[PDB]
Amino acid sequence: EIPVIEPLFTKVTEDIPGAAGPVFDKNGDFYIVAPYVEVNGKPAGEILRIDLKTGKKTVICKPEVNGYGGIPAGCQCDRDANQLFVADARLGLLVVQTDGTFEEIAKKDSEGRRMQGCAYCAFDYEGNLWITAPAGEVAPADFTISLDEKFGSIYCFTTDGQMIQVDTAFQFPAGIAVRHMNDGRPYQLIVAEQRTKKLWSYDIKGPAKIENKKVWGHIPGTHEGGASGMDFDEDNNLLVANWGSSHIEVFGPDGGQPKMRIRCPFEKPSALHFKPQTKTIFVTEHENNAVWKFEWQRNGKKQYCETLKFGIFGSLEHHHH
Template sequence: MRLGILTVKPNGEFTQVARVDEGGRTMQGCNDCSLDYTGNLWVTAPAGDIAPNEYLRSFEEGFGSIYCLTTQGKVVHLDTGLRFPNGIAVVHDVNGLPVKLIVAETPTRILWAYDIQGPGSVANKTKWAKLPDCEQEGGPDGMDFDDVGNLLVAHWGAGHIEVFGPDGGEPIKRIKCPFDKPSNVHFEPNSNIVYVTEHTNHALWKFQWENKGMPQYCDKN
């Protein structure tokens, strides 16, 4: 969240992708990302302007943004005004084309949906789902689709993985975790094994889900 978007090699060397977007605005600090099947990278940015600017985050004030790093190397600023946009996922149609972007807004517990009109272009922001209330401060964090279109969402602070059907709305299932702050979920390729990161103890867990994960960009290409 201090350097925006990075590319990291297997040996740990990294490169900062951009300091400004295609409009010349300073990049905001990023948090989560998802590749669609055509190779565009969709990114949430809950922090303020990247270093050396002062570190700020949009948990209270809604200045969080979303970006798209296109296959042409353009960093497109898509939207702003979000309170700590966090997890992000892409819905594809039966032909493998990206059609919808799901973005988690943690403090409000809302999952927003945008229609994808093309690389670096979205429209029609709507509320796709809202996570159940919880006693602690928290909300949606990382997320991943299974291969029948269910979205598994880490509910940070509530100790659950919330499962939403392909059309959003209310959770169709809730998976109880043995800890309060699941932060990210990700399927093992071609498997029903789900890995879960735990925020408090910096731990990694796994469980078996009833379906395999949706194929990733790397599985398709």
């Protein structure tokens, strides 16, 4: 029904338990997270730097708060400083410096509620951070995932430093991406509900202001698991890892059904991310606990963490003259 392409995948690294959160920082260094690392049967997840020339893996941060180890599950870099925002299914949302120190951004949200554990996040170009939270309350609450009960939530961490819960009642909310229009403005928030075959959209009307929740797209397949991570290319096609499959789905800007599929040499892609200024997509996957790369048909969308650089700054917004 749908065209399938089969690009050459190249293995980057392997033996990363629960491999996810591929991300590039402001300098082009590459990081991933290993959520399933354990010590004595307890979480001890890791944030890793991967040297793309040598393949060498370096543990950047082994987060823990009051003796509760983390489950780092997704990442985005900051443009303002060379620090990573790490969605942690046990600890919430962390800011991790490249030197390994970290700060937990929130024990509680804007309503005084205990924070939920997070997994993916996405900046809009105005600087707000949109976050999926598939786990229940952070440590020291007992760990719970919204696999069977609809308690996964969505947050927005605004430029004013407010952690606002903007929706809930999701069954493993996973990938999240912002659709920016040609004038640079945030228009739609896209959210994967991984325990269904659905992608949801909201219209962004401002910081932490979303409305008009609708079904945006449908994920093919009848196996366990749907959309995990997702990313826009420069034409606002959305590439969506289908964890219940060996494909990445390609949606047009207006969603619906995929218009093309990318066949992968592996099952269970968990996350994907473009390398800045390239067509190269890095993909994490849980069949092999591994990281791969492949060349897409065009560039990715300009990334938040490049937006203060000469040659990028000033080129995102466009207006009538």
